[PDB]
Design a protein around this ligand. Structure first.
Ligand code: CLA
Ligand code: CLA
Ligand code: CLA
Ligand code: CLA
Ligand code: CLA
Ligand code: CLA
Ligand code: CLA
Ligand code: CLA
Ligand code: CLA
Ligand SMILES: CCCCCCCCCCCCCCCC(=O)OC[C@H](COP(=O)(O)OC[C@@H](O)CO)OC(=O)CCCCCCCCCCCCCCC
Lengths: 152, 737, 80, 41, 73
């Protein structure tokens, strides 16, 4: 129990929140005929709410005294899916985007009028460069070793 | 007079941005080029100096505007046919809230599809289209679908006309300068014939269908509109005078048409709106008047007036040559005409906003409070913006098209030779009004805080009665039978006749009393309007020269300053006077709409019981609480904002989100208004340094925004945030209650 | 009166002396540039401090400089 | 048309196409897998 | 936005773990970290347990004052 927290599946306030949300959704359904489309939409909403609460219960989250999930970002292995894995994925994607942009900027620097290639993009060259960023960590690290990453 | 194929239709110019300007076509050395591209896009005068080319360009863009408007109307009509509860609302207008928009369930946003009645879930609309369609006799969705299709076809036609009249047959300059023919056609044909056609539609369609609806008939059991035309027996049953045909019209026996052409006045008790027979008679008379008025100006047949001849004959001992020379100025300058038309259109919009609330023209509109409030506020804002644009383009004309060597006019010359007296007098009037209007509120606040309520300007201690407006109200209330014998009731219920109209347990309209608070708020309105007129007129009158900068006309219309000399010259151009008057227009319109909202919720709107006792929304606290600033802060802003701050978790949560978003946008504008360019240009230099280090420096050198661009961004964000905040507050408050 | 100074990086373009809204600046002969000219500032008691001259100078950094100083009736542009 | 292809490569049109496709992809991703608070795999 | 749509359980709420650990290291026992001064068998606890720790621990574990208030997201 990190920081005095409790698992979601044992939390009574979590169940009370679920019951309140479902009861609020159900009071609107009594205003419509069961065959009507709004009744179908409300049924789908209720099912989705139940599924969301069940999924939050399954993943091993931690609740406070208010029955709301809390995130642990200290690096504990039991909660790596909360912060670590999405962080690594985001870092990979952002590095991809930055590397592709830098490669395109370097590619057109030697032209007669490099400015005109920035307002009117050269589509084939960018398309050829787009795929190359999939391996950006290796290329960036090898460029850092060779000393070509930093301008002299 | 046209030219055959003046400009080739090609995609070549699409690939060369800035082709309209020599400077912009060179290329983007810095990022200022991109901003310069958009600011000068529609300034056709700077592109070319030929008046014929400018006229040809102007004529074609209005076709695109008409096409966009037709597309918007087509969308509005289509959404009512497919995604609305109009047919359910038509059977019970008083218990069902109109709705014409639905939302896809994606990220939990389906909560916005709250209930509105009639087995429908969607967003409640406040544009008033349902009442417009009901007053036209529309019953089913097939008619709305047909109207949407027709509007789409008309949009396509407008687009084709816009292409044609620029690329295939462009009219010559002599065609544009025919003002007599244009005035004759726009008076007799555009307005008179349109009014006559609408009167015919109201006579043959709206009256019988609306009579059937008011009688209580199921909308699906009402005969179709064409059945009233092919079967004259039905109309004869509804109106016996239709059995005589058009014979009374041609024999001058017009009194026989009194059944469907009345002069009643007041409101219809069943629906709470104006009688439709009065509207039909009004449109008929207006059509006649406009048809007669369109035969005044001379054309190819010698009979009529010459506008130049009329202008040249109006001169006096105080004005010298008078209006001589004004005909040549108004036929060679597009900016002066634009300024005049903008001012007139803004004034007309404000008049329309004032008139539609006191004489509700649509059925079941007075008892729909949200629609009334929304329409009033919308049209007030539109009128204010147009009025400011008028002064902007007047200043543009003064800077550019003023040339006394070939376009001399004595009236304009005499105004420029005593501008100091005008500006000084307006300054004194503004100071006097500000002291004697806002000072009375501070006196009240101090006296209330000190514990001396008997020394306040109020209805109980020191009365300031608006006796001039009360006299007008009394005169208008007693008009029928004395000065308007042909009328049965007064023009409006607000004059003070004493009668009350209630529709479905709600109050539609009733007399509006005037007291001490109205005096103060009206003088506040006068003060704000006078200050705005000061800033705009000073800006127009000193556009060319002053004692500070004699050569101001050589620097242009839109320049930032003339340096730190002469003690400092920031904001001397005419553009800066529009920039400063936008803030005062915002202030004035905000005060006006707050006055309208509080007065309506306090003294007019409410519910009526079986015994005949009225309970207003706020309980009539306007008279005693609005005489202090603390009252406005507490009983208006604090109390009525509880609806918008408690909207989370319900169908009104979008307004709650927009409240905070608009707060953020308003606060974000102060960064651009309080700071200057040099700091941001110095800061960018350090950021560019690290981009050079990693070889990611762009070839288009980054630049800070110009002085004018920063001013424009600040004012735009300031207005957007403020208006959006007020919009969300009003809608969230009025939909709930 | 304000202070107006000229530096020997001047190229003799004349653009500063054409821009001045009061007659403060004038051209004099010189040697040290191709044009054989330099600006001079004899009348700085009539300077208003507008900096129109500095906006017109084509040198990388200005060969004409204006330093604002004690203010008088002429330098404030007062016609009261 | 070469000029038509050039106009399709200008910055605003290309940015609009890219962002529209991106928003569509994100909307469909959140539609297939709603209410993601943790990376469970 | 999560509160607006009526689903408060979708919020991103992050515990201030480092500050809570520091508070526990001063003798607070509301988080159950049991480090340093919150540990009864630590050398740091044994060093000052006869001089100032009793009164300080009494003051820090009483919630009616403002000494090391409890913290959250
Ligand atoms: C110019 C005014 C205007 C505006 C503001 C809207 C706005 C809207 N329309 Mg719409 N519409 C318009 C004109 C307009 N329409 C016209 C003229 C027609 C043809 C007569 C339609 C036909 C139409 C249909 C058939 C549908 C909409 C829908 C919608 C909504 C979702 C739009 C969407 O997802 O597009 C996404 C963006 C694209 C480019 C596609 C949105 C509120 C949809 C809706 O309400 O769904 C429930 C829907 O199904 N519209
Ligand atoms: C599809 C057919 C077509 C083609 C190929 C052209 C081609 C041309 N027109 Mg043109 N025009 C057309 C239809 C067309 N027009 C129509 C239908 C109208 C009537 C509205 C006009 C009205 C018109 C005027 C008034 C002028 C031209 C001019 C020109 C020439 C230079 C401008 C230009 O292309 O810059 C690039 C232009 C664009 C990329 C177009 C941007 C304009 C926007 C997209 C209009 C759409 C309105 C709005 C933005 C959309 C909804 C509103 C909201 C979303 C904001 C060029 C040869 C100019 C000329 O010859 O001067 C030398 C000129 O002054 N046209
Ligand atoms: C431009 C408008 C317009 C148009 C197109 C028509 C068209 C028509 N009217 Mg008409 N009408 C109009 C305005 C118009 N009216 C106005 C303003 C009045 C009020 C004075 C009337 C009063 C009127 C009467 C009293 C009658 C018509 C009738 C008719 C129809 C036979 C002629 C014809 C469809 C006749 C009809 O219904 O016969 C089929 C008929 O008896 N009209
Ligand atoms: C019928 C009305 C009308 C017409 C035809 C014109 C026409 C003109 N005006 Mg004008 N004006 C009007 C009303 C009108 N005005 C009003 C009512 C005002 C007062 C507010 C002004 C204030 C005004 C000023 C202050 C200036 C003009 C200028 C001009 C000229 C150039 C305009 C230009 O390049 O636009 C360019 C258009 C834009 C840059 C678009 C602006 C977009 C707005 C501000 C923000 C919209 C926010 C939007 C919702 C966010 C979505 C963004 C999207 C990318 C996601 C042109 C002749 C200029 C001129 O003549 O200079 C010499 C000038 O300086 N006007
Ligand atoms: C809430 C802040 C505030 C206030 C109080 C004012 C007040 C004023 N502005 Mg203003 N303004 C503001 C914000 C404000 N502005 C903002 C944000 C902008 C946008 C940049 C502008 C832009 C602007 C322009 C462009 C102009 C003004 C002008 C004026 C003056 C109008 C003439 C007059 O006498 O009014 C009435 C004066 C008052 C209501 C202030 C007095 C307050 C009460 C009466 C207290 C009096 C105390 C009393 C004298 C005893 C005190 C003694 C002491 C020992 C305690 C007035 C002084 C105009 C001007 O110069 O005059 C024509 C003008 O042209 N303003
Ligand atoms: C000065 C203010 C004033 C105004 C605005 C009006 C306005 C009007 N009067 Mg009127 N009237 C006035 C003073 C005024 N009257 C006075 C002082 C008298 C003498 C007591 C009358 C006697 C009078 C008569 C006798 C009639 C009108 C009628 C009318 C209406 C139509 C008149 C017309 O030409 O069309 C119109 C609303 C006529 C009417 O009832 O129209 C419906 C009508 O028959 N007026
Ligand atoms: C490929 C483009 C690119 C790259 C590699 C960088 C890289 C960098 N920027 Mg940066 N920047 C860019 C574009 C780019 N910028 C643009 C377009 C702007 C204007 C909005 C800025 C504004 C900016 C500021 C204000 C600051 C940086 C800073 C930095 C550095 C800190 C890391 C970071 O993420 O800062 C954060 C960077 C951002 C938030 C920029 C927004 C990201 C944009 C939207 C990406 C655009 C990519 C572009 C469209 C590429 C198209 C590729 C295509 C042609 C194939 C880093 C070296 C910081 C620094 O160290 O100061 C020197 C800093 O303070 N940048
Ligand atoms: C109403 C019918 C309907 C249906 C059943 C779908 C179904 C789908 N759309 Mg879709 N879409 C629709 C209408 C519809 N769309 C409309 C009207 C538009 C606007 C024009 C779009 C715009 C749109 C975009 C922009 C994208 C989708 C994508 C997808 C796929 C998402 C799954 C995925 O990424 O896996 C992978 C895809 C598949 C397994 C099969 C494809 C899915 C098959 C996404 C997609 O295809 O991802 C690659 C995507 O990026 N749609
Ligand atoms: C840096 C700020 C930030 C961060 C880290 C997140 C992170 C997240 N948002 Mg989010 N969001 C943000 C700003 C941010 N948002 C803003 C500013 C808005 C308003 C436009 C939203 C509106 C928003 C919605 C509407 C939704 C998310 C959702 C989510 C979750 C995404 C689930 C998935 O698979 O994708 C994720 C935890 C989704 C979710 O279910 O979260 C649990 C979801 O439906 N966000
Ligand atoms: C002063 C009385 C109002 C004015 C008045 O008598 O109007 C009429 C008066 C005389 O006009 P004239 O007969 O000279 O000219 C009539 C015009 O139609 C000629 O263009 O106007 C002026 O002398 C200018 C007033 C400017 C504004 C003065 C301050 C207000």
């Amino acid at each position: 129990d990190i920081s005095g927290l409790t698992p979601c599946k044992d939390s009574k306030q979590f169940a009370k929140r679920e019951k309140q949300q479902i009861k609020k959704l159900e009071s609107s359904l009594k205003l419509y005929a069961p065959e009507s489309a709004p009744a179908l939409a409300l049924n789908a909403q209720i099912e989705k709410t139940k599924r969301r609460f069940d999924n939050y219960g399954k993943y091993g989250l931690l609740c406070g005294s208010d029955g709301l999930p809390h995130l642990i970002v200290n690096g504990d292995q039991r909660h790596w899916g909360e912060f670590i894995t999405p962080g690594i994925l985001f870092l990979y994607i952002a590095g991809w985007i930055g590397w592709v942009g830098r490669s395109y900027l370097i590619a057109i620097s030697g032209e007669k009028k490099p400015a005109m290639k920035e307002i009117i993009i050269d589509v084939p060259l960018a398309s050829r460069i787009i795929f190359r960023g999939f391996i950006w960590p290796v290329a960036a690290y090898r460029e850092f070793l060779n000393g070509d990453l930093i301008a002299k | 007079l046209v030219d055959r194929d003046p400009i080739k239709t090609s995609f070549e110019e699409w690939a060369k941005p800035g082709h309209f300007s020599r400077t912009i076509a060179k290329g983007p050395d810095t990022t200022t080029w991109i901003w310069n591209l958009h600011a000068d896009a529609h300034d056709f005068d700077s592109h070319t100096s030929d008046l014929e080319e400018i006229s040809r360009k102007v004529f074609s863009a209005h076709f695109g505007q008409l096409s966009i408007i037709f597309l918007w109307l087509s969308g509005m009509y289509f959404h009512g046919a497919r995604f609305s509860n109009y047919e359910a609302w038509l059977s019970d207008p008083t218990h069902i809230g109109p709705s014409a928009q639905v939302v896809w369930p994606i990220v939990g946003q389906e909560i916005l599809n709250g209930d509105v009645g009639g087995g429908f879930r969607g967003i409640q609309i406040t544009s008033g289209f349902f009442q417009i369609w009901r007053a036209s006799g529309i019953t089913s969705e097939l008619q709305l679908y047909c109207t949407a299709i027709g509007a789409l076809v008309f949009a396509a036609l407008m687009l084709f006309a816009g292409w044609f009249h620029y690329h295939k047959a462009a009219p010559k300059l002599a065609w544009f300068q025919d003002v007599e023919s244009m005035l004759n056609h726009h008076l007799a044909g555009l307005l008179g014939l349109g009014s006559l056609s609408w009167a015919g539609h109201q006579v043959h369609v709206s009256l019988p269908i609306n009579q059937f609806l008011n009688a209580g008939v199921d909308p699906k059991e009402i005969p179709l509109p064409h059945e009233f035309i092919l079967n004259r027996d039905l109309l004869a049953q509804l109106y016996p005078s239709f059995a005589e045909g058009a014979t009374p019209f041609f024999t001058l026996n017009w009194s026989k048409y009194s059944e469907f052409l009345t002069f009643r006045g007041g409101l219809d008790p069943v629906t709470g709106g104006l009688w439709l027979t009065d509207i039909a008679h009004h449109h008929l008379a207006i059509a006649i008047l406009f048809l007669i008025a369109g035969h005044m100006y001379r054309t190819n047949w010698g009979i009529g007036h010459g506008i130049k001849d009329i202008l040249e004959a109006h001169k006096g001992p105080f004005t010298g040559q008078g209006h001589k020379g004004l005909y040549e100025i108004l036929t060679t300058s597009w900016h002066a005409q634009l300024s005049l038309n903008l001012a007139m259109l803004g004034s007309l919009t404000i008049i329309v906003a004032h008139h539609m609330y006191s004489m509700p023209p649509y059925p079941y509109l007075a008892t729909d409070y949200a629609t009334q409030l929304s329409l009033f506020t919308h049209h007030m804002w539109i009128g204010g913006f147009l009025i400011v644009g008028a002064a902007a383009h007047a200043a543009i004309f003064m800077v550019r098209d003023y040339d006394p060597t070939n376009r001399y006019n004595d009236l304009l010359d005499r105004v420029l030779r005593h501008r100091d007296a005008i500006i000084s007098h307006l300054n004194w009037v503004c100071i006097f009004l500000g002291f004697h209007s806002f000072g009375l509120y501070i006196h009240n606040d101090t006296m209330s805080a000190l514990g001396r309520p008997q020394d306040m300007f109020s209805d109980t201690a020191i009365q300031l009665q608006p006796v001039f407006a009360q006299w007008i109200q009394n005169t208008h209330a007693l008009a029928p039978g004395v000065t308007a014998p042909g009328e049965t009731a007064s023009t409006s219920l607000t004059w003070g006749g004493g009668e009350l109209v209630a529709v479905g347990g709600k109050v539609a309209l009733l007399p509006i009393p005037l007291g001490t608070a109205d005096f103060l708020v009206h003088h506040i309105h006068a003060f704000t309007i006078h200050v705005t007129v000061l800033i705009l007129l000073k800006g127009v009158l000193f556009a060319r020269s002053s004692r500070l900068i004699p050569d101001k006309a050589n620097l242009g219309f839109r320049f930032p300053c003339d340096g730190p000399g002469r003690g400092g010259t920031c904001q001397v151009s005419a553009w800066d006077h529009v920039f400063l008057g936008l803030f005062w227009m915002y202030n004035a319109i905000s005060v006006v709409i707050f006055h309208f909202s509080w007065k309506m919720q306090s003294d007019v709107w409410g519910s009526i019981s079986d015994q005949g006792v009225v309970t207003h929304i706020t309980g009539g606290n306007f008279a005693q609480s609005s005489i202090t600033i603390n009252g406005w802060l507490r009983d208006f802003l604090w109390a009525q904002a509880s609806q918008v701050i408690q909207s989370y978790g319900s169908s009104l949560s979008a307004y709650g989100l927009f409240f905070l978003g608009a707060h953020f946008v308003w606060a974000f504008s102060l960064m651009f208004l309080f700071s200057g360019r040099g700091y941001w240009q110095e800061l960018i230099e350090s950021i560019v340094w690290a981009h050079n280090k990693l070889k990611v420096a762009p070839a288009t050198q980054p630049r800070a925004l110009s002085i004018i661009q920063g001013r424009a961004v600040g004012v735009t964000h300031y207005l957007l945030g403020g208006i959006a905040t007020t919009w969300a507050f009003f809608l969230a408050r009025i939909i709930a209650v | 009166s304000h202070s107006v100074k000229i530096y020997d990086t001047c190229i003799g373009c004349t653009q500063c002396v054409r821009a001045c809204p009061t007659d403060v600046l004038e051209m004099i002969p010189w040697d040290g540039c191709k044009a054989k000219q330099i600006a001079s500032a004899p009348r700085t008691e009539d300077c208003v401090g507008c900096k129109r001259c500095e906006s017109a100078c084509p040198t990388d950094f200005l060969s004409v400089r204006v330093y604002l100083w004690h203010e008088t009736t002429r330098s404030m542009g007062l016609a009261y | 048309m070469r000029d038509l292809k050039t106009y399709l490569s200008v910055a605003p049109v290309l940015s609009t196409l890219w962002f529209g496709s991106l928003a569509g992809l994100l909307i469909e991703i959140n539609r297939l897998f709603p209410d993601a608070l943790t990376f469970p795999f | 936005v999560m509160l607006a749509f009526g689903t408060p359980e979708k919020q991103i709420l992050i515990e201030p773990i480092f500050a809570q650990w520091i508070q526990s290291a001063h003798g607070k026992t509301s988080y159950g970290f049991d480090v340093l001064l919150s540990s009864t068998s630590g050398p740091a606890f044994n060093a000052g347990r006869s001089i100032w720790l009793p009164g300080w621990l009494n003051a820090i574990n009483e919630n009616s004052n403002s000494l090391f208030l409890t913290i959250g997201p």
